[PDB]
Write a protein that binds this ligand. Structure first.
Ligand SMILES: NS(=O)(=O)c1cccc2c1c([N+](=O)[O-])cc1[nH]c(=O)c(=O)[nH]c12
Ligand SMILES: NS(=O)(=O)c1cccc2c1c([N+](=O)[O-])cc1[nH]c(=O)c(=O)[nH]c12
Ligand SMILES: NS(=O)(=O)c1cccc2c1c([N+](=O)[O-])cc1[nH]c(=O)c(=O)[nH]c12
Ligand SMILES: NS(=O)(=O)c1cccc2c1c([N+](=O)[O-])cc1[nH]c(=O)c(=O)[nH]c12
Lengths: 268, 276, 275, 268
């Protein structure tokens, strides 16, 4: 496994992979900076291979087409052999694991509650799913077609079921087409809307200007990212062991801190 | 399959596996109940394989020995063929993955701060009373020294502080090493007892899952505050090269997506909690 | 029993049956939804038969004419072979029972008092308790500063005309001697009168509609007191039909299984606008 | 159907059928007084038959034996042809209707909450199932083996499910052996126990001395007493029509007032 460069697949997502402000005086792997680029560099250092960053063409996370049974995006690139390693924020799920091999999660995840940061003593801010379920003054919504809405749709917990029935019997539909529009709506709603999105994006947005949103409450569910390879690839064990080493020695947490708070534009 | 019954090794540690009430009249797997027993039930249903619960005689989770280079505990039992599946709180760790293979984590956890519940402090608005927690996170824990914080004398919790390079978790380690008298405890139960007895002047740094279990026990005098310092996982370990790795991994993933794992955690933490 | 399609007569009256959104692109039973539609679905599942919803053309629940002696409404349809099953709110009444056979009541109801929601009145401050001026029928009858009435016909007026418990007798005496006219042509008109009267008028209507209206905008009506009398809604079948027993057992099984309570909750509170 | 006397079967339950204080100087139907005796008299008047009151020997409501598949009590006496009409508080259920024919309900009932009759303006007495479910200071319990406990066992509503989980994970077991012991325990509990029982019994207990219990909230479920006859009996239609006539004319609501409030030992 030497004298060969591996085509690495990843996606433009902030802050995992971002284009440098000095992009057009740099070439190769120097064009991209972010959490996942440094993660790929450290993994290539530990395993001992040369690699080249190559962005997925269609810019989507892998999904299965219901009528052609084909995989698109980074997962599709992995399955058909176009790329070797996907060091990207690719969530570990049942469907994807059946076709590709995921390493141990390098970053935990979960569903979080996003609100605008604001008898007086008797007021109580929302801090859990039960508080949001019991109170209906502030409407809450998710992405129009995403894993979060599907999770509340299929959930068997009583609180989540009641929340789902609240969403499905409320008009206008609070579901938002895209994450940017949802964050803009939360900003412009003046505390009358709560957005339910993944915890990492909620934490990163909290460290973004103008700093009028905050993350409150624990994760409703448990998910984890991963570094995927094609099934039967020879690099599964080295990648898994490297991820474990970076997790134990605190390198993963150090990069997360650097790209979430150290480089954040907001104080803490 | 159902070809033969497998040895599902497990550790006797609440609330994962506890002695059931009137366990003498039950036989086999019915003597033990808990989160891990039910998880084993669902895993065996998903794979369609009969199993028998066999607690490891040693009573240790597993660690390499210094000189003999032998493996003890659950990891040792898995390595030397005495068992095949370990449905237990066995942390996914690098040195434990060099001899066996772990599945995806069925429960995420990390080091969490344990403090006594705030009470009606003796004085030196009255309609509603707000209990203010004196400590909110690890940064406040390190900044203020009126409260001493401790960990277990030999484990992942202490080694994390020994190996950490972040400024907060390095200052914490420096203070804990220079602390007088000895701050490390012998057992987790003894540490919890010390926290309860110290009247809120001592904080303990133990795993989040156990913290949530102890918090929901009588007399409701312990609570969890702050986020997890690090990230870890609990896995269903299988021996290296075993054919049971893939079915177990897919079963855990299916259970996690179906919400059954969250249901079991709720049932065995809050629904059956004695505190409220 | 599944090849043949039966005629399930029903009445267009919310929330039991309503016009579904974009009903023009649907066909058959999909154009109508509600408590009665889903109840018919469950009953047809239990009996294992195919059905088609056919709203009665007349638009009346059912009564016998004075001189012609011809039944009208769903009762008339059942009597003269137009339909076979009448899953709809049809009160189990003696005069309806003498000609057709009713099943067990799938929902119990009775005459209930309707009042405007209590509001802050223009003449401790931390918490505010809204005191209802009326607590039951006895308090309503004892104090006469408020006016109360019912629709100009139906079961309520006859019940007040026929009661002998000496309390509803006094209520009927006040209602008949009241000036101006207290009876309302329609229940919607009575609800509008209650809302307009600024809490100075009460309406005596059945409990199911009272709870339905209470959970509709502007959420200015509320239910007070217990039921004055007891009645029930039955799944009527024609006399001598072979479908009586399967329907009766299906309703009983649904009632015990809790599906009926689930349906009532879902179509009263879950879809209510004041939730 | 003339020149023949029918054997009525009914149980001794108050206020339905109670032995007279002057029992030993009266004979025949004059021995028993109560709601059901007057109901039987009115039904015999309307239908036009002679009847004799007879009590079930074992004094139980009909239940199906899991081993011998035999019916006991009044239902058992009806099935095997020992008696004709059962004018008693016999609840209409799916199991019994399969073997015997019930008339339309002459008395509607349901499961209700009974509590001892008792920052200061913020307290609120329990008035609904949700309030009892969300509050845990006051324990609640049902009969050890009855339709109420089974109803909370099989219930699919979230509130009732949470209530049942509270019952099954609480010690000591609040489930009381008998109704009399249940009301005694509630009376001696000093407001720390709420007993869940049938609505009619709760209303009568409310009107019994020393008047320290009350009924709150609406009926959680819907049931109804009935007048049963053997399947295929010639008196099904006359009894059904008579019950409907008494329901509309108000005779049942008059007997209820006579035997619940008019003859009650408590003011109102
Ligand atoms: N940015 S997002 O709004 O919160 C987000 C929304 C919806 C789906 C996401 C997703 C993110 N993510 O965090 O980058 C990662 C990810 N990874 C997968 O593998 C997958 O299937 N779906 C997703
Ligand atoms: N804080 S605890 O309640 O007592 C505790 C609870 C649960 C699992 C533990 C554990 C501790 N420990 O002693 O720190 C160490 C340890 N080590 C392993 O290797 C493993 O797999 N699981 C564990
Ligand atoms: N309070 S309501 O909304 O308007 C009303 C609602 C629902 C059913 C009703 C009904 C009224 N009504 O006019 O009094 C009369 C009536 N008569 C029947 O025979 C029957 O079966 N159902 C009904
Ligand atoms: N009121 S109670 O003592 O607390 C009572 C408790 C429990 C079950 C009862 C019951 C009464 N009852 O009204 O007498 C009647 C009844 N009739 C049936 O057919 C049946 O199945 N169960 C019952």
């Amino acid at each position: 496994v030497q004298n060969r460069t591996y085509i690495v697949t990843t996606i433009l997502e902030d802050p995992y992979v971002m284009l440098k402000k000095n992009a057009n005086q740099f070439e190769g792997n120097d064009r991209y900076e972010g959490y996942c680029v440094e993660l790929a560099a450290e993994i290539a250092k530990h395993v001992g291979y040369s690699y080249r960053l190559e962005i997925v063409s269609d810019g989507k996370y892998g999904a299965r087409d219901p009528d052609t049974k084909a995989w698109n995006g980074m997962v599709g690139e992995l399955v058909y052999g176009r790329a070797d390693v996907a060091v990207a924020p690719l969530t570990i799920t049942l469907v994807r694991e059946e076709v590709i091999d995921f390493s141990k999660p390098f970053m935990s995840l979960g569903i979080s509650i996003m609100i605008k940061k604001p008898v007086e003593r008797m007021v109580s801010p929302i801090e859990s799913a039960e508080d949001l379920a019991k109170q209906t003054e502030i409407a809450y919504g998710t992405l129009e077609a995403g894993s979060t809405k599907e999770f509340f749709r299929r959930s068997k917990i009583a609180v989540f079921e009641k929340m789902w029935t609240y969403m499905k019997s409320a008009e206008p539909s609070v579901f938002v087409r895209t994450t940017e529009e949802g964050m803009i709506r939360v900003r412009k709603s003046k505390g009358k809307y709560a957005y339910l999105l993944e915890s990492t994006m909620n934490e990163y947005i909290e460290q973004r200007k103008p700093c009028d949103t905050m993350k409150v409450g624990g994760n409703l569910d448990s998910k984890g990212y991963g570094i995927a390879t094609p099934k039967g690839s020879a690099l599964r064990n080295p990648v898994n062991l490297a991820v474990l080493k970076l997790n134990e020695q605190g390198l993963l947490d150090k990069l997360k801190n650097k790209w979430w708070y150290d480089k954040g534009e907001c104080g803490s | 399959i159902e070809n033969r019954t497998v040895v599902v090794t497990t550790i006797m540690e609440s609330p994962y596996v506890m002695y059931k009430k009137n366990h003498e009249m039950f036989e086999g797997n019915d003597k033990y109940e808990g989160y891990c027993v039910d998880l084993a039930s669902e895993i065996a249903k998903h794979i369609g394989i009969k199993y028998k619960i066999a607690i490891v005689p040693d009573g240790k989770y597993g660690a390499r020995d210094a000189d003999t280079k032998i493996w003890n505990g659950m990891v040792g039992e898995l390595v030397y063929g005495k068992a095949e599946i370990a449905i237990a709180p066995l942390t996914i760790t690098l040195v434990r993955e060099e001899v066996i293979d772990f599945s995806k984590p069925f429960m995420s956890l990390g080091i969490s701060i344990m403090i006594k519940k705030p009470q009606k402090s003796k004085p030196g608005f009255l309609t509603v009373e707000r209990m203010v927690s004196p400590i909110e996170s690890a940064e406040d824990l390190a900044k203020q020294t009126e409260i001493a914080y401790g960990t277990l004398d030999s484990g992942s919790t202490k080694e994390f502080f020994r190996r950490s390079k972040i400024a907060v978790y390095e200052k914490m380690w420096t203070y804990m090493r220079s602390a007088e008298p000895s701050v490390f405890t012998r057992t987790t139960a003894e540490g919890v007892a010390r926290v309860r007895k110290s009247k809120g002047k001592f904080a303990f740094l133990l795993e989040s899952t156990m913290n949530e279990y102890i918090e929901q026990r009588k007399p409701c005098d312990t609570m969890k505050v702050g986020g997890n310092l690090d990230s870890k996982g609990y896995g269903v370990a299988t021996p290296k090269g075993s054919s049971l790795r893939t079915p177990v991994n897919l079963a855990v993933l299916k259970l996690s997506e179906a919400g059954v794992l969250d249901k079991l955690k709720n049932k065995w933490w809050y629904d059956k909690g004695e505190c409220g």
